Amino acid sequence: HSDGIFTDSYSRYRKQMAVKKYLAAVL
Amino acid sequence: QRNEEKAQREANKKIEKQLQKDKQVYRATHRLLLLGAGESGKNTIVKQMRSGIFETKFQVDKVNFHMFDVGAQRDERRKWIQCFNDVTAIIFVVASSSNQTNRLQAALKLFDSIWNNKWLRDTSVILFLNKQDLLAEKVLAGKSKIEDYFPEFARYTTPEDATPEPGEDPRVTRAKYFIRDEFLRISTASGDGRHYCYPHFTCAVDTENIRRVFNDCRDIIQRMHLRQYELL
Amino acid sequence: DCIFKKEQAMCLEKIQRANELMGFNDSSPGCPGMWDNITCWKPAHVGEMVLVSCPELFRIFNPDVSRNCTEDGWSEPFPHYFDACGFDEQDYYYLSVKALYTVGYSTSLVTLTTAMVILCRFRKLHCTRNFIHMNLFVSFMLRAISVFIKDWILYAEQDSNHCFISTVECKAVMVFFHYCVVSNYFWLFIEGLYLFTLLVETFFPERRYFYWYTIIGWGTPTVCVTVWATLRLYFDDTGCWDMNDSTALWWVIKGPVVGSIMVNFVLFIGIIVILVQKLQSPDMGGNESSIYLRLARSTLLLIPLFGIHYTVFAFSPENVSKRERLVFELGLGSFQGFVVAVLYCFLNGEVQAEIKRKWRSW
Amino acid sequence: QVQLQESGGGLVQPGGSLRLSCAASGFTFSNYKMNWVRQAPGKGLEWVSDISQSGASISYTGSVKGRFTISRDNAKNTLYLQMNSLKPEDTAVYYCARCPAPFTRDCFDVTSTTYAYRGQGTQVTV
Amino acid sequence: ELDQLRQEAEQLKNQIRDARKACADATLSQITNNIDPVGRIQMRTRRTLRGHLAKIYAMHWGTDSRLLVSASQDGKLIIWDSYTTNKVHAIPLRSSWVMTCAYAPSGNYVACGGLDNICSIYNLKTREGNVRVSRELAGHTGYLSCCRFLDDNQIVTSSGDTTCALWDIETGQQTTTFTGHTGDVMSLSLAPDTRLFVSGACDASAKLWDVREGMCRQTFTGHESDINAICFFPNGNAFATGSDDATCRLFDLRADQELMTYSHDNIICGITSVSFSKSGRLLLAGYDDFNCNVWDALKADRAGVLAGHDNRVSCLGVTDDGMAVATGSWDSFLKIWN
Amino acid sequence: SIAQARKLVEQLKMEANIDRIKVSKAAADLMAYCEAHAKEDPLLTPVPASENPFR
């Protein structure tokens, strides 16, 4: 359903942003 | 006392379960009223389907229908007609051929009174016009005319969507369609959507009255449900 | 620091104890394998190539490395050899969409609460139809409450702690969320089944149909969410189950919704066919010859009650036109619960008549 | 006590004109729909004409349509029936009838025998 | 000659009207203008009896003011315990078109009747356990509209054939016949001494009959349309009649003329049932506008309004002790107000 | 018919020979009865819940 798709997309986006910031801090 | 109270509770719950079963039975069955004149020939119609009031039970497609006749009641019907306000439909019987009195005008007035009644505003009427063969033969003979009773019949024009039976001359078809259109005008004068009329042409030898009544009742119930959901 | 960083932490232990417990070639090798933030390394000899691989943390951006050893130790991969594995390569949009459906859900919740109270306070409006409607409104209530609770737990509380959170409470909240959503979708289907059943099975109007409809509508979401929770706990227990990484597991709960939507569209088409058949009668209907116009007033009256708008993006894949799908189904569909409350309660003729009768009597 | 009195009937040559008057008392005349009915010798009661409370709605039977006129005067609480081009078949006892209930569009059993709200009627011979 | 008889009847009517006019010197309203009004009357729905499937026409309270009986179109005669709301009895009916019901003063029998032109008598106190049909009455040629129990052996019924009948239960034959009405008799009321009874028909007139003599004593013509309800005053000297002209009227047997008219401009719907309180000060009338009105019987003032029913009110009754008033309507529910 | 008219005339003659008391006397009697039994009228005034079987 739409709610689940939006929740998955937002969680993936937040995880990707966290990975980007952690990698930038490391590298 | 506690004992009498619990006995009363047990009796009440037994009555409640019996009333639940009776409610299921009552909702299963559909009630119809039958109305017509003495010369309207509704007796042969009852024989087709088949004391103060006469009851007829018949099952069509596993659906129970309970028809109630006028019985032994006087012509003053302004009081007991209020009983049949929650019935599924009111079947009206009109002798289309009728030559003593203007019985057609009396039938039209009675139909108008039923249609315009405040307690019958939500009740649908299924109209049946008997003596079709008698009307056809009296039109063919020409000794009896309808223009004297209804002067507008001379200027009446057969509708383009009419579907006359094979082997029927246009004169009787025009006469019967004018008779039907009178009832259509009366029904369309008031009550735009509260209730509908379902006129039909039938004879003493017709056997499709059962199916016609069944289909009309189905249509009435479907229209009632749609109106409740405001879809019309 | 945070849990995620703490993740890489046990590499700093995992190899070292493995080097001490079962032993290696040398106690002090010339190229000691020590943990790096790019990948979880292993010890090896000097001058050889170690074919390690970076973990799944790099593999988060798409839906599916070596270093030289010297006497000093590791060698810096200057020619961009550190990012060889994976890593091939919206906030305002997500925030706007979140605020949009939050406002829509709040408005729908308030309007439906008013409608439910005004319907409960009156006894003349008690019937199977209104009962089915009430359950649809309860389903909407639970859906909105679940949306708010999930938003507060998964994201609003995440900002407060700023670190990873993985507890039983968040998983239970997600399960409740899924149950509420599936219950709402199923009750939109039930609304269609009841009217089609009324409009088709005109006779034999047993009340057993309503009881079975209530049972199925409140039971199938429970079965689906229990199955989904068991599958998540037994196969993929990652995070708070907010990411549908597994395709089959997500389809397990997505399939009933799509089927419900399709069957509701079919029944809506059948109801429209029956209605246009009724409206084409010469005597009972007509009287204006613009019957289509009246039909239009019916169509707009049935789309919000059946969720016909869900059929637009039901066939489309999730990845294709995801932003437009989220704007339409979620951003604009969150008012659906409000819309029906306006249509099937406030604009109802008998409800308005009862309201005016009560007002004139008080 | 509700009562209706009919007057004006008499012997008239064919093709003549006549005026029938109905005087009402015991009820509010303006609140009821009025009717004119006839009974021919050896024949049953049949409805002839009717007029609503305000007089806007007026209906006639087809036999005498275009020849008979019906009017009411609420100030004088009276009803008038003008007869033109009379025919021998119009010879009958004419009765002035009141609807059983006020503010009702329908009107039941006004042609029924032994109606309580019907006048004595007057004889018209053509 | 018919003309001579008509003229004589007209002269007699004029003489009676002149005697009534000469006998009327003052009106009840101006005589009662010196007493204080009862004020606003507030009543709440203490009990709501549910279980009927179709519209209820008639009900009758018991002499113990605890058990009542109701008749509905589903072919059900249900005997209710008002105190505990529990159903005491549920008798199915052969004919589902019941329009009246009565409860015997002794409480051992109930009465039924409707479009079948049959006034069935059911025995409640059966040794074998449940209610069964006790007596069958098949004399009336019209629909039964009202029936009241004089005792366990004599009953009085009103029918649509413009006649009333006093029946003996054991013999099952018409002991007495009352004729004179020109319309469908819709209701009858029994005097406290059970020696006289007033009947109202569809001819805007009410007739008082002597039970023993079997002849009409007085006739009252003040209404404009059909009378649907009738009820004596607590003393056997006056009675109130509600008609389809949206008016109730009070008539005195001794005065033989109108006393007071209860009506209002906003009321344009007929009255279905009327009843008096224990003291007779309040007159409760059920109307077609889904509401019941409690009037001051001495000042023609609308003391109160009961607006609990969602459909047309068909019956209304007051307990013997006057503790509560029960209203039945065309919906499926009975209401008990106090 | 003649029989119906004769019966109506006979009934009118029977009803016209009775005696009628003054309307003021009847009104006074009704007032006296209403005021004599006013206390024992539970509908006239609210009844306490202790003495009310329904509540």
The answer to whether the Cα torsion of C13, C17, C20, C26 is positive or negative is negative
D117 with D4: CB under 8 angstroms? yes
C-alpha to C-alpha distance for E211 and E188, rounded to whole angstroms: 12
Strand order in the sheet with E132-135: E98-103, E109-114, E119-123, E132-135
CB contact under 8 A, D1 and E204: yes
CA distance B3 to chain E (A): 14
Closest listed residue to residue B179, CA positions, set B219, B131, B225, B230: B131
* CB neighbourhood size of D8 (10 A): 15
C184 with C143: CB under 8 angstroms? yes
Angle at F36 between CA F33 and CA F42, to 5 degrees: 100
C-alpha to C-alpha distance for C358 and C184, rounded to whole angstroms: 32
C304 with C336: CB under 8 angstroms? yes
| C61, C108, C139, C140, best to mutate vs chain A, most A CBs in 10 Å | C61
Name chain A contacts of C333, Cβ cutoff 8 Å. 2
Closest listed residue to residue B112, CA positions, set B198, B200, B186, B190: B186
C337 with C304: CB under 8 angstroms? no
* CB neighbourhood size of C141 (10 A): 18
What is the third-level CATH fold of E2-337? Methylamine Dehydrogenase; Chain H (2.130.10)
CB contact under 8 A, E281 and F5: no
Name chain D contacts of E226, Cβ cutoff 8 Å. 100-101
Instruction: Please list, residue by residue across E151-167, b when 16 or more beta carbons sit within 10 angstroms of its beta carbon and e when fewer do.
Output: ebebbbbbbbbbbbbbb
CB contact under 8 A, E202 and D28: no
Closest listed residue to residue E272, CA positions, set E75, E44, E55, E51: E55
Q: Which residue type is seen at D102?
A: P
Whether B79 and chain C come into contact, CB under 8 Å, resolves to: no
**Secondary element (H or E) of residue E81:** strand E76-81
**Structurally, how many domains does chain B consist of?**
1
Query: Which residues, at least 6 apart from D60, have a Cβ–Cβ distance to it below 8 Å?
Result: D48, D49, D68, D70
The per-residue DSSP string of C94-122 comes to HHHHHHHHHHHHHHHHHHHHHHHHHHHT-
Angle at B54 between CA E311 and CA B83, to 5 degrees: 10
Helix axes C168-200, C291-306, angle to 10 degrees: 150
The answer to whether the Cα torsion of E261, E264, E268, E273 is positive or negative is negative
Q: How far is CA C312 from CA A23, C193, C256, C258, in A?
A: 40, 20, 17, 11
C-alpha to C-alpha distance for E184 and E198, rounded to whole angstroms: 14
Name chain E contacts of D116, Cβ cutoff 8 Å. 182-183, 202-204
DSSP structural state of residue C246: -
Neighbours, chain C (3 or more CB pairs < 8 A): A, B, E
First to last CA, chain D: 34
| A8, A11, A16, A17, best to mutate vs chain C, most C CBs in 10 Å | A11
- The CATH number of whichever domain residue D27 belongs to comes to 2.60.40.10
CB contact under 8 A, C243 and A12: yes
Query: Which residues, at least 6 apart from B23, have a Cβ–Cβ distance to it below 8 Å?
Result: E53
Contact flag for F and E (3+ C-beta pairs < 8 Å): yes
For F45, what's the count of Cα atoms within 13 Å in the CB-facing half-sphere? 7
For B141, what's the count of Cα atoms within 13 Å in the CB-facing half-sphere? 11
Beta strands in D1-126 (DSSP E): 3-7, 18-25, 34-39, 45-51, 58-60, 68-73, 78-83, 92-98, 122-124
Domain range enclosing B61: 1-232
CA distance B116 to chain D (A): 5
C-alpha to C-alpha distance for E309 and E290, rounded to whole angstroms: 6
Q: What is the 3-state secondary structure (H, E, C) of chain B?
A: CHHHHHHHHHHHHHHHHHHHHHHHHHHHCEEEEEEECCCCCHHHHHHHHCCCCCEEEEEECCEEEEEECCCCCCCCCCCHHHHCCCCCEEEEEEECCCCCCCHHHHHHHHHHHHHHCCCCCCCEEEEEEECHHHHHHHHHHCCCCCCCCCHHHCCCCCCCCCCCCCCCCHHHHHHHHHHHHHHHHHHHHCCCCCCCEEEEECCCCCCCHHHHHHHHHHHHHHHHHHHHCCCC
Whether E216 and chain F come into contact, CB under 8 Å, resolves to: yes
For residue E91, what are the β-bridge partners?
Answer: E77
> What kind of experiment solved this structure?
cryo-EM
C-alpha to C-alpha distance for D103 and B40, rounded to whole angstroms: 31
- State the count of interchain CB pairs (< 8 A) between C and E: 4
Closest listed residue to residue C105, CA positions, set C143, C77, C55, C133: C143
Closest listed residue to residue E108, CA positions, set E159, E36, E169, E57: E169
**Structurally, how many domains does chain F consist of?**
1
Instruction: Please list, residue by residue across C287-303, b when 16 or more beta carbons sit within 10 angstroms of its beta carbon and e when fewer do.
Output: eeeebeebeeebeebbb
Query: Which residues, at least 6 apart from D19, have a Cβ–Cβ distance to it below 8 Å?
Result: D8, D80, D81, D82, D83
CB < 8 Å from F in window 222-261 of E: 233-235, 237-238, 252, 254-257, 259
Q: Which two tokens stand for residue A23?
A: 């990698």
Residue E271's SS3 state is strand
C-alpha to C-alpha distance for E69 and E88, rounded to whole angstroms: 10
Query: Which residues, at least 6 apart from A2, have a Cβ–Cβ distance to it below 8 Å?
Result: C310, C313, C325, C326, C329, C330, C333
C-alpha to C-alpha distance for E325 and E46, rounded to whole angstroms: 10
Whether C124 and chain E come into contact, CB under 8 Å, resolves to: yes
CB contact under 8 A, F9 and E281: no
E241 with E200: CB under 8 angstroms? yes
E131 with E124: CB under 8 angstroms? yes
C-alpha to C-alpha distance for E179 and E197, rounded to whole angstroms: 13
Angle at E30 between CA E24 and CA E36, to 5 degrees: 145
E156 with E150: CB under 8 angstroms? yes
CA distance E215 to chain F (A): 9
DSSP β-ladder status, B63-68 and B30-36: parallel
- The CATH number of whichever domain residue B215 belongs to comes to 3.40.50.300
C-alpha to C-alpha distance for D17 and D94, rounded to whole angstroms: 15
Q: Which residue reads 């993929």 in tokens?
A: C236
Q: Which residue type is seen at E281?
A: R
E298 with E32: CB under 8 angstroms? yes
Q: Enter the resolution in angstroms.
A: 2.3
For residue B129, what are the β-bridge partners?
Answer: B94, B201
Neighbours, chain A (3 or more CB pairs < 8 A): C
Query: Which residues, at least 6 apart from D71, have a Cβ–Cβ distance to it below 8 Å?
Result: D51, D55, D79, D80, D82
CATH of C90-361, one of 1.20.1070.10, 3.40.47.10, 3.40.50.720, 3.30.70.870: 1.20.1070.10
Instruction: Give the distance from CA B151 to its chain's centroid.
Output: 27
What region does B191 belong to: left with phi over 0, alpha with psi -120 to 50, or beta? left
Domain range enclosing F55: 1-55
Q: Which two tokens stand for residue C268?
A: 């809506």
CB contact under 8 A, D101 and E182: no
Angle at E196 between CA E190 and CA E198, to 5 degrees: 60
Q: Which two tokens stand for residue E282?
A: 């309040």
The answer to whether the Cα torsion of D25, D27, D30, D33 is positive or negative is negative
B84 with C226: CB under 8 angstroms? no
C-alpha to C-alpha distance for D117 and D114, rounded to whole angstroms: 9
Residue C239's SS3 state is coil
C-alpha to C-alpha distance for E272 and E99, rounded to whole angstroms: 12
B137 with B171: CB under 8 angstroms? no
Q: Which two tokens stand for residue E321?
A: 């002790």
Q: Which residue of A has its CA nearest to C259?
A: A1
Backbone angles phi, psi at B68, to 5 degrees: -120, 125
C-alpha to C-alpha distance for C309 and C296, rounded to whole angstroms: 16
CB contact under 8 A, D101 and E244: yes
Q: Which two tokens stand for residue E162?
A: 């413009």
Neighbours, chain E (3 or more CB pairs < 8 A): B, C, D, F
Using CB atoms within 10 Å of the CB of residue B21, give its burial: 0 to 12 exposed, 13 to 18 middle, 19+ buried.
exposed
E202 with E223: CB under 8 angstroms? no
Name chain C contacts of A26, Cβ cutoff 8 Å. 37-38
What region does D12 belong to: left with phi over 0, alpha with psi -120 to 50, or beta? beta
Whether E42 and chain C come into contact, CB under 8 Å, resolves to: no
Instruction: Tell me what percent of chain E is helix, strand and coil, each rounded to the nearest 5.
Output: 10, 45, 45
C-alpha to C-alpha distance for F28 and C216, rounded to whole angstroms: 72
Q: Which residue type is seen at C148?
A: F
Neighbours, chain B (3 or more CB pairs < 8 A): C, D, E
C-alpha to C-alpha distance for E195 and B64, rounded to whole angstroms: 48
Instruction: Give the distance from CA E207 to its chain's centroid.
Output: 14
Closest listed residue to residue E172, CA positions, set E230, E119, E249: E119
Q: Which residue type is seen at B166?
A: P
C-alpha to C-alpha distance for E168 and E151, rounded to whole angstroms: 10
Q: Which residue type is seen at E78?
A: I
Domain range enclosing D30: 3-124
Backbone angles phi, psi at E94, to 5 degrees: -65, -40
- State the count of interchain CB pairs (< 8 A) between A and C: 70
C348 with A21: CB under 8 angstroms? no
C-alpha to C-alpha distance for B77 and D113, rounded to whole angstroms: 12
C-alpha to C-alpha distance for D47 and D45, rounded to whole angstroms: 7
